[PDB]
Design a protein around this ligand. Structure first.
Ligand SMILES: Nc1nc2c(ncn2[C@@H]2O[C@H](COP(=O)(O)OP(=O)(O)NP(=O)(O)O)[C@@H](O)[C@H]2O)c(=O)[nH]1
Ligand SMILES: [Mg+2]
Length: 166
């Protein structure tokens, strides 16, 4: 069956792992558990297609940049995640996108911009600003909560649909 290699990137603590674990294991992880590199494989049916999602969960910490680059190289699509209460993680998106472009030698790779932690009332990044950034890159913007599961399937399934249209 078709295998889609999806890579989840973004600053430390934005919820990359929580989103992935919500998808795969149906539970919200509330603990402090920094990732080095983890990979998940799950068989799913998306729009009637049987496919294997191979999800590569990366570290947000800059010490692991080399390893992150190796993994980004094999990826077919990327989830670029920031948190809606963390303005620095939003600013850092440009830098993760630029690295993806350099690693893939491409101006256009299937990607979705994800604004996570949308359950939180204390928002510092407005949906309007994120949407303007996404439009400037030519990619979809999805808001998610790993805590409530809002947007979780949408983010991953939208990415797969983008890979299908590349
Ligand atoms: N309220 C809320 N909290 C979240 C959400 N997603 C993650 N968190 C919390 O934020 C913290 C970090 O989440 P985690 O998934 O570990 O982030 P990460 O991006 O994978 N960090 P790293 O880059 O170190 O691997 C955890 O305490 C987690 O429970 C969310 O959608 N809403
Ligand atoms: Mg993590």
């Amino acid at each position: 069956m078709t295998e889609y290699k999806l890579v989840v990137v973004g600053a430390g603590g934005v919820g990359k792992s929580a989103l992935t674990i919500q998808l795969i294991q149906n539970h919200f992880v509330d603990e402090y558990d920094p990732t080095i590199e983890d990979s998940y494989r799950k068989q799913v049916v998306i729009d009637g297609e049987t496919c294997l999602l191979d999800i590569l969960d990366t570290a947000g910490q800059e010490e692991y940049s080399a390893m992150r680059d190796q993994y980004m190289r094999t990826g077919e699509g990327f989830l670029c995640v920031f948190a809606i209460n963390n303005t620095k993680s939003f600013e850092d998106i440009h830098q993760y996108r630029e690295q993806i472009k350099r690693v893939k030698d491409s101006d256009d790779v299937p990607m979705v911009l994800v604004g996570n932690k949308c359950d939180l009332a204390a928002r510092t990044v407005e949906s309007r600003q994120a949407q303007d950034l996404a439009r400037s890159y030519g990619i979809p913007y999805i808001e998610t909560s790993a805590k409530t599961r809002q947007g979780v399937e949408d983010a991953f399934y939208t990415l797969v649909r983008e890979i299908r249209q590349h």
